[PDB]
Design a protein around this ligand. Sequence first.
Ligand SMILES: OC[C@H]1O[C@@H](O[C@H]2[C@H](O)[C@@H](O)[C@H](O[C@H]3[C@H](O)[C@@H](O)[C@H](O[C@H]4[C@H](O)[C@@H](O)[C@@H](O)O[C@@H]4CO)O[C@@H]3CO)O[C@@H]2CO)[C@H](O)[C@@H](O)[C@@H]1O
Ligand SMILES: OC[C@H]1O[C@@H](O)[C@H](O)[C@@H](O)[C@@H]1O
Ligand SMILES: [Ca+2]
Ligand SMILES: [Zn+2]
Length: 528
Amino acid sequence: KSIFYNQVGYLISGDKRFWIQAHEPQPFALRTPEGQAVFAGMTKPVGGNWYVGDFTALRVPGTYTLTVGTLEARVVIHRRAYRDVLEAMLRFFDYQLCGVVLPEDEAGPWAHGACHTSDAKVFGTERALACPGGWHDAGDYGKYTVPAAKAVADLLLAHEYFPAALAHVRPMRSVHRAPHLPPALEVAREEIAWLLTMQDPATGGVYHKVTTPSFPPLDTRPEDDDAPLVLSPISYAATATFCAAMAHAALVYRPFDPALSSCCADAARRAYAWLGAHEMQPFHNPDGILTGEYGDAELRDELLWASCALLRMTGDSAWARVCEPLLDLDLPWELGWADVALYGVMDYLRTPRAAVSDDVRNKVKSRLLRELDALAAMAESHPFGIPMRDDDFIWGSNMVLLNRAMAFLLAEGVGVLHPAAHTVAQRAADYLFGANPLGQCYVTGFGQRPVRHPHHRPSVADDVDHPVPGMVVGGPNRHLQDEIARAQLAGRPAMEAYIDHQDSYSTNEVAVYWNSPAVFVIAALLEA
Ligand SMILES: OC[C@H]1O[C@@H](O[C@H]2[C@H](O)[C@@H](O)[C@H](O[C@H]3[C@H](O)[C@@H](O)[C@H](O[C@H]4[C@H](O)[C@@H](O)[C@@H](O)O[C@@H]4CO)O[C@@H]3CO)O[C@@H]2CO)[C@H](O)[C@@H](O)[C@@H]1O
Ligand SMILES: OC[C@H]1O[C@@H](O)[C@H](O)[C@@H](O)[C@@H]1O
Ligand SMILES: [Ca+2]
Ligand SMILES: [Zn+2]
């Protein structure tokens, strides 16, 4: 038996909760490290077989010993408890940089020379094309347009919403250009710059991904990976998500990098022209390409996002003719990577009210509220207070969770203020940092039970026991979609369907689009 808690820490002014498996209320105490009790209370039932202890009213910063029954845990309370972990989570993006020297003074053990520097060949042609830069998507070295757009969107949103919190962190500053932009925008620019090179100049269409034809060994260092790079065909989804992301970037970078902003604005417009002239064809891996497909049969949510993004970028009411009918569809309103309608909803809602139909706008806001109410209900019935059900624990469940937390916080910027918003955010972070049935901190390098063996090639290649820090893992996946999970996790409840093993890619991989909602949510909490 043990105490389950936020292993990174708690905010002075934030909610403070711990969990234990018990069958009745027990007293508990928080004590200074010399041992004197500073706070005492009683645990209370929350379902399954869980009790919780609330020590929110302890406001004095320090490292305390939580004791309950015969168990003890070490809990930290601090003004900005999540500053280190947010910085690590943002630095992950720079650790993923492709085609750039990462020096040892910035990147420590994981420093390396520029990787994947060769030109990629366009699929089914002899043509070559340079598209250097950007991020290795995940545990592999491929760069995929569709998930890249979500990661960029999320970082841009975190800058718009929580610039003060983000001002307190430092990326790998010396690998980026001077004069230095604010942290989120500095980091995001490297991906935006890469995305721009994935657009076909002749048509406006965007290539779906650039990868080697297959995955290299788990042991491969990035600079050792010398297989030819292949540009997979142009896709509707890539072109639409590129459009939306570039349109978002055009607005955000206006006062920071006017050349980039103007360049993104025009690229978004050329992408949208491509969408207008082409069919909504789902992407499938071409033959001889075995890397991540990032396919998606439903493409109207991507068009929605592209259209709403351009609406807000231009402020032209003309775009609302095409947006508002897409906003009426029964699409799921989610934050990607495949179901991206809520990004579009947010662009629509953050457009000047004069540019849109007031009728439609209030209906959109009403639906957003009903959605949040539904998520809030899930959270009430869950023992750890997270907006999740057992069936939500799929591949990348940590992202499912963080996107839901993100939705509550995004809504507060568009006049939909749900009372559960900040509780949900705190519970999400608590869960991510150890307040779960496995007592598992799902970020590398933090907490008392960190992730130690992520499915991540740079980590596997150097030290298989000490990985790159600040990486958020996929989390429990009840579908057991790799050999290690099938072997070791059959019959376990959904939230326990995780294993810290380097070969469990379906529960223990990492991704730029899993760090990006975590950056947003943790930034929100830091803005205390
Ligand atoms: O199965 C029932 C359940 O499915 C839900 O959709 C899930 C789906 O189950 C799952 O297979 C899929 O997993 C994706 C994952 O989202 C994606 O992040 C991951 O990305 C890989 C990539 O393919 C690799 O190239 C690489 O670089 O690593 C990354 C990170 O692991 O790939 C897998 C498989 O392609 O996720 C779906 C969600 O989009 C349904 O939503 C639900 O309704 C069903 O009940
Ligand atoms: O199914 C996709 C998975 O395949 C594995 O072989 C790769 O190592 C992972 O990077 C990838 O997520
Ligand atoms: Ca879609
Ligand atoms: Zn690379």
